[PDB]
């Protein structure tokens, strides 16, 4: 009954998000959150009858500070996803003490995911605020701003609106579906 469109009028397919995922993520990375360290994860799943289902939350090998996190062994992540035929549907990460928003770095990261899958989503958890948000770039205009960007500085701003929250009912729908958590860390 509910069909979503980008800013340029392209159809977005629905992504079914397990209700438990946000909470389970917070629990699984809680140790880090406690040491004021950020953590990221990959939202993995399958395409069935023109809709995507998130089935796996994958915690990759990574490094972190109180305000950054990054993967360090993407080959191990590829091997897991390839063996299990899991698509990359988006990503999730914490802002242990900051508000819920997409940073410059966050947008540069997400742009590439969203170029590769128009439906891709970025989930940002702000546990110290008990807030969270599901974001994507504006398409095409936000994607264009970030693709053409050549500004240095981890915190550089961009001209114009670049991103938005996914709408409610949306292309993302939160459903009572099962979830597997895969921790590729030591």
């Amino acid at each position: 009954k509910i069909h979503a469109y980008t800013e340029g009028g392209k159809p977005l397919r629905t992504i079914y998000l397990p209700k438990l995922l946000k909470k389970v993520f917070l629990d699984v990375v809680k140790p880090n959150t406690k040491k004021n360290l950020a953590t990221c994860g990959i939202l993995c799943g399958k395409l069935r009858q023109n809709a995507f289902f998130i089935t796996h939350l994958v915690i990759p090998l990574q490094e972190a500070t109180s305000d950054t996190c990054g993967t360090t062994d993407e080959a191990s992540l590829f091997e897991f996803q390839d063996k299990h035929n899991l698509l990359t549907l988006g990503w999730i990460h914490t802002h242990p003490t900051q508000t819920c928003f997409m940073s410059s770095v966050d947008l540069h990261t997400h742009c590439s995911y969203q170029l590769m899958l128009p439906e891709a989503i970025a989930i940002v958890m702000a546990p110290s605020k008990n807030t969270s948000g599901i974001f994507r770039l504006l398409d095409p205009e936000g994607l264009q701003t970030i693709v053409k960007c050549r500004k240095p500085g981890l915190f550089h701003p961009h001209e114009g609106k670049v991103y938005t929250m996914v709408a409610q009912p949306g292309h993302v729908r939160e459903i009572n579906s099962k979830l597997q958590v895969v921790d590729l860390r030591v």
Binding site: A38, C40, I42, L47, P60, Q62, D67, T68, C69, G70, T71, E74, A75, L77, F78, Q81, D82, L86, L87, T88, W91, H93, T94, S103, S104, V105, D106, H108, T109, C111, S112, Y113, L115, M116, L117, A120, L143, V147, L154
Partner: protein, 76 residues
């Protein structure tokens, strides 16, 4: 010659390359065509991650070979 770069999102990218091209050349081509900067790309062929200063011929990548693209993830 044409090679393919298969993502983890159900997309296949077609590139025009020569055997003599380096991996960093190939990542630049991906950026030109697809808008992904080279520093976010990791390319895998035959189970191994490709290193920037080597050539396609160093890994026996030939006409119509398929490489795989996996992206880094950075929050910041």
């Amino acid at each position: 010659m044409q090679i393919f770069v298969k993502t983890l999102t159900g997309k296949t990218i077609t590139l025009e390359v020569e055997p003599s091209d380096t991996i960093e050349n190939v990542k630049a081509k991906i950026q030109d065509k697809e808008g992904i900067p080279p520093d976010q790309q990791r390319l895998i062929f035959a189970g191994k991650q490709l290193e920037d200063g080597r050539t396609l011929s160093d890994y026996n990548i030939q006409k119509e070979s398929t490489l795989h693209l996996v992206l880094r993830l950075r929050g910041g």
